[PDB]
Scaffold this active site. Structure first.
Site, short mmCIF file in Angstrom:
data_model
loop_
_atom_site.label_atom_id
_atom_site.label_comp_id
_atom_site.label_asym_id
_atom_site.label_seq_id
_atom_site.Cartn_x
_atom_site.Cartn_y
_atom_site.Cartn_z
N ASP A 16 0.75 -1.35 0.11
CA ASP A 16 0.14 -0.01 -0.13
C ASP A 16 0.91 1.32 -0.03
O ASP A 16 0.38 2.40 0.19
CB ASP A 16 -1.02 0.12 0.97
CG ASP A 16 -0.43 0.03 2.65
OD1 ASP A 16 0.70 0.29 2.63
OD2 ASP A 16 -1.12 -0.47 3.58
N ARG A 30 0.94 6.73 0.06
CA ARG A 30 0.31 5.76 0.72
C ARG A 30 -1.21 5.73 0.18
O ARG A 30 -1.88 6.80 -0.06
CB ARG A 30 0.11 6.31 2.14
CG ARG A 30 -0.78 5.29 3.15
CD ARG A 30 -0.06 3.87 3.17
NE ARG A 30 -0.77 2.94 4.49
CZ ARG A 30 -2.01 2.46 4.15
NH1 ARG A 30 -2.75 2.74 2.84
NH2 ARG A 30 -2.56 1.96 5.22
N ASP A 35 -5.77 -1.30 3.66
CA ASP A 35 -4.59 -1.46 4.33
C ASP A 35 -4.12 -2.72 3.96
O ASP A 35 -4.86 -3.94 3.97
CB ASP A 35 -5.14 -1.62 5.82
CG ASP A 35 -3.92 -1.63 6.95
OD1 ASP A 35 -2.60 -1.23 6.55
OD2 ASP A 35 -4.03 -2.59 7.63
N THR A 36 -2.93 -2.94 3.46
CA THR A 36 -2.25 -4.06 2.99
C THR A 36 -1.68 -4.66 4.16
O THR A 36 -1.09 -3.95 5.27
CB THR A 36 -1.45 -4.10 1.87
OG1 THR A 36 -0.67 -3.09 2.11
CG2 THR A 36 -2.06 -3.67 0.71
N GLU A 38 1.59 -5.87 6.48
CA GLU A 38 3.04 -5.57 6.53
C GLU A 38 3.67 -6.70 5.77
O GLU A 38 3.28 -7.93 5.77
CB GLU A 38 3.51 -5.38 7.89
CG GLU A 38 3.34 -3.82 8.38
CD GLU A 38 4.44 -2.87 7.50
OE1 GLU A 38 5.60 -3.22 7.39
OE2 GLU A 38 3.86 -1.74 7.25
N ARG A 76 3.73 11.61 3.61
CA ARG A 76 3.30 10.74 2.44
C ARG A 76 1.99 11.28 1.62
O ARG A 76 1.29 11.70 2.44
CB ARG A 76 3.14 9.22 3.02
CG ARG A 76 4.16 8.83 3.60
CD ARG A 76 4.12 7.16 4.09
NE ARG A 76 2.85 7.12 5.01
CZ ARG A 76 2.44 6.06 5.51
NH1 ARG A 76 2.85 5.07 5.26
NH2 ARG A 76 1.25 5.94 6.13
C1 LIG Z 1 -4.01 5.67 4.91
C2 LIG Z 1 -3.93 6.70 5.98
C3 LIG Z 1 -2.98 6.52 6.71
N1 LIG Z 1 -2.53 7.69 7.66
C4 LIG Z 1 -1.51 7.47 8.86
C5 LIG Z 1 -2.53 6.76 10.01
C6 LIG Z 1 -1.42 5.92 10.57
O1 LIG Z 1 -0.74 6.95 11.44
P1 LIG Z 1 -0.33 6.38 13.00
O2 LIG Z 1 0.67 5.10 12.89
O3 LIG Z 1 0.17 7.66 13.46
O4 LIG Z 1 -1.69 6.29 13.55
C7 LIG Z 1 -0.67 5.57 9.54
C8 LIG Z 1 -0.83 4.14 8.97
O5 LIG Z 1 -0.02 3.79 7.89
P2 LIG Z 1 0.38 2.61 7.64
O6 LIG Z 1 -0.72 1.48 7.39
O7 LIG Z 1 1.25 2.53 6.26
O8 LIG Z 1 1.57 2.11 8.82
O9 LIG Z 1 -0.88 6.43 8.41
C9 LIG Z 1 -3.25 8.84 7.63
O10 LIG Z 1 -3.09 9.82 8.17
N2 LIG Z 1 -4.33 9.05 6.65
C10 LIG Z 1 -4.63 8.02 5.88
O11 LIG Z 1 -5.40 8.06 4.84
CA LIG Z 2 -0.19 -1.36 5.84
#
Ligand SMILES: Cc1cn([C@H]2C[C@H](OP(=O)(O)O)[C@@H](COP(=O)(O)O)O2)c(=O)[nH]c1=O
Ligand SMILES: [Ca+2]
Length: 130
Positions: A16, A30, A35-36, A38, A76
């Protein structure tokens, strides 16, 4: 209505996230609304492989921002990514390689589309849903 913008492949990252050159800047995108797993979780390597091949095999790569936040706290880009007109976010969900996730009111234009894909993947018991 959202609009698609050109971007160019720099490199795959995982199921993702993808590194694209956008307006001359290397950015990690991102994927919105999904959510994929890890990479070292079950289906992780498969979702990585699916996003990587879908993008790098496409002649035309596009990014589409939603109406709300365009970057998260990590810097991102938050986008729907298209590969020859097919949405990667949707294709992962349809194949059971991502869940619908991180659904926020500012930034949920394709929520119903992705939920319809997810319900198909659950009916078929594919991957995450098997
Ligand atoms: C998809 C997405 C993730 N995020 C943030 C939420 C999570 O942050 P926190 O870890 O601070 O809570 C993180 C999850 O991304 P990943 O699934 O890549 O780990 O990306 C956003 O802020 N907005 C979004 O639309
Ligand atoms: Ca993920």
């Amino acid at each position: 209505k959202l609009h698609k913008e050109p971007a160019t492949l720099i490199k795959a990252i995982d199921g993702d996230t993808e590194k694209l050159m956008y307006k001359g800047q290397p950015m990690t995108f991102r994927l919105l609304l999904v959510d994929t797993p890890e990479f070292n979780e079950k289906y992780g390597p498969e979702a990585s492989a699916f996003t990587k091949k879908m993008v790098e095999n496409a002649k035309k790569k596009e990014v589409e921002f939603d109406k709300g936040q365009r970057t998260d706290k990590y810097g991102r880009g938050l986008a729907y990514i298209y590969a020859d007109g097919k949405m990667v976010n949707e294709a992962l969900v349809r194949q059971g390689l991502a869940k619908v996730a991180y659904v926020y009111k500012g930034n949920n234009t394709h929520e119903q589309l992705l939920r319809k894909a997810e319900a198909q993947a659950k009916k078929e018991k594919l991957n995450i849903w098997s």
